[PDB]
Paper text:
The sulfonamides (sulfas) are the oldest class of antibacterial drugs and inhibit the bacterial dihydropteroate synthase (DHPS, encoded by folP), through chemical mimicry of its co-substrate p-aminobenzoic acid (pABA). Resistance to sulfa drugs is mediated either by mutations in folP or acquisition of sul genes, which code for sulfa-insensitive, divergent DHPS enzymes. DHPS catalyzes the condensation of para-aminobenzoic acid (pABA) and 6-hydroxymethyl-7,8-dihydropterin pyrophosphate (DHPP), producing 7,8-dihydropteroic acid (7,8-DHP); this compound is further transformed, ultimately leading to tetrahydrofolate, an essential precursor for DNA and RNA synthesis. All three Sul enzymes adopted the (ɑ/β)8 TIM barrel fold also shared by DHPS.
We determined the crystal structure of Sul1 in a ligand-bound state, and the [name] and Sul3 enzymes in both apo and ligand-bound forms to resolutions between 1.74 to 2.8 Å. Comparison of Sul apo and ligand-bound structures revealed conformational changes in these three loops triggered by ligand binding. In particular, loop 1 is oriented further away from the ligand-binding cleft in the apo structures of [name] and Sul3 as compared to the structures of these enzymes in 7,8-DHP or pABA-bound states. Similarly, loop 3 in [name] and Sul3 also undergoes a large conformational change upon binding of pABA or 7,8-DHP. Finally, in the [name] and Sul3 structures, loop 2 undergoes conformational changes in a more confined space in presence of the ligands. We noticed that the Phe residue that is conserved across Sul enzymes (Phe178 in Sul1, Phe179 in [name] and Phe177 in Sul3) and localized to the active site adopted different rotamer conformations depending on ligand binding. In general, the sidechain of this residue and its environment (ɑ6) showed higher crystallographic B-factors than the average protein (i.e., for the [name] apo structure, B-factor of Phe179 sidechain atoms were 32 to 67, for ɑ6: 20 to 53, and for the protein average: 36).
Numbering used by the authors:
A (entry chain A): 3 to 269
B (entry chain C): 1 to 270
Amino acid sequence: KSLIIFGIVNITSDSFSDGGRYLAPDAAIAQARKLMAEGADVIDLGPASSNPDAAPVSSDTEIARIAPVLDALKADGIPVSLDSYQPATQAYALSRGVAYLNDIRGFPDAAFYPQLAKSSAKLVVMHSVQDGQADRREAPAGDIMDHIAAFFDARIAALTGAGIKRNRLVLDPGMGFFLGAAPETSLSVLARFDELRLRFDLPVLLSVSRKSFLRALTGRGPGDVGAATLAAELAAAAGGADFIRTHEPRPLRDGLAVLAALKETAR
Amino acid sequence: MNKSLIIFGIVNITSDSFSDGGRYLAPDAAIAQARKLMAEGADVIDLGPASSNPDAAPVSSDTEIARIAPVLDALKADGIPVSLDSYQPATQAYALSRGVAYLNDIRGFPDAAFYPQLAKSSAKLVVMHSVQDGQADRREAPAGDIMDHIAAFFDARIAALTGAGIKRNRLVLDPGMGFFLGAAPETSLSVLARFDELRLRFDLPVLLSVSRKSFLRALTGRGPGDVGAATLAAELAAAAGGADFIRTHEPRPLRDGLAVLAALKETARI
Ligand SMILES: [Cl-]
Ligand SMILES: [Cl-]
Ligand SMILES: [Cl-]
Ligand SMILES: [Cl-]
């Protein structure tokens, strides 16, 4: 009911973590506890780097990396959304009882749906314009919201028809590179994602934190978009976003507390 | 009043010749801070000649003028507009002789003996409400709605000023915040949520200053206790609520945040 914050943790290496661009399972564990301490409700755990330029590791490598992280978060009572598009990793994560699966491919392979149907984990179904084609960087001609709605029309039908109950679904319309090169495309979705909540009567997750289009609206480099991110997340929250996936839970937590305190005053 | 949001960057001179990169800024360090804040997106520098900490010993008007004179020199040469934030009439008089763009008085210009000097200047006037109202020990407004008490303050003070020859459109209304409103964070929250009532009742622009006010600390959680994120959220809320001016210690996060909200609004309108 209240905004749920996903804290981003991406395991980047098998054994060497240096507190910068390299994250190992031991230190992934410390980052997860730190993000919960800063106000996250869930750790959105990625078994590999987010950048498409790194060599994609195997489902076997993803499982080996997340296995010790899942043991300790389960011990801590720390909820996990397992962020992987690889079905063998998804199946392993479901066997460990994760709270969510988060698939940047949006669960496109119907042969896998019986395994999704027999679990209770919630599914973050993400839209992208790539849809499996790295070369495809834009949606088809027309209104981006029209194409996203039509994507979810078809995919929700496929998933729920296979027995995945619709109240397990969380809709992620995509953001930044998953929508197109132009900042206007991401701004349209950030402004209009509640059209999807209303169309489907389903919750929406957004991930805007540190996305490149924010740097276009500010003119600053990578380590200076903290305020633009907070403003974008607060605007999403005020627009009714049910989940926000972020790198820095504390500024968002603090900002939300101010907004909550203001509306409670005007009641 | 229909123009875009105007940002005042806060710069206080807190020493005569001591600069430590932290709380103490001599005039040359205040010049460097003023220049930085405009580069970070301020439109005007709200320049205080002394510490705004109530536990600092107040300095004489002679000391205030000596501190601000070289800062006004430098900012005039830079073309940087100044709101001179001082409550001492002698300092205000000096600022007016230097042609500052605004005067900003935490006492709200309460002394009619000074009005003839206000009336023959062109400086815009930031008229600040406080529950102290000279009674510095007074910590709370009288019984009733705080917003009703603020409106009644501006009712009388606007009439007093405009009748003395100060044209109405020189006036900017600051309802006060934090200590100037009361001890309870709910009281500052009430003004932050409802100041639009003052814009409607007087048809005058409203200035808000929430930056780093202690009441925000009650809304941060457990942790180191940084207030920058809570400050930005309150300032963005004020902007969305129609604030004409925002006075802040950090213009850059606010400019960045406003640019996001503007692009979103433009997206929705088109
Ligand atoms: Cl287990
Ligand atoms: Cl819903
Ligand atoms: Cl201080
Ligand atoms: Cl001059």
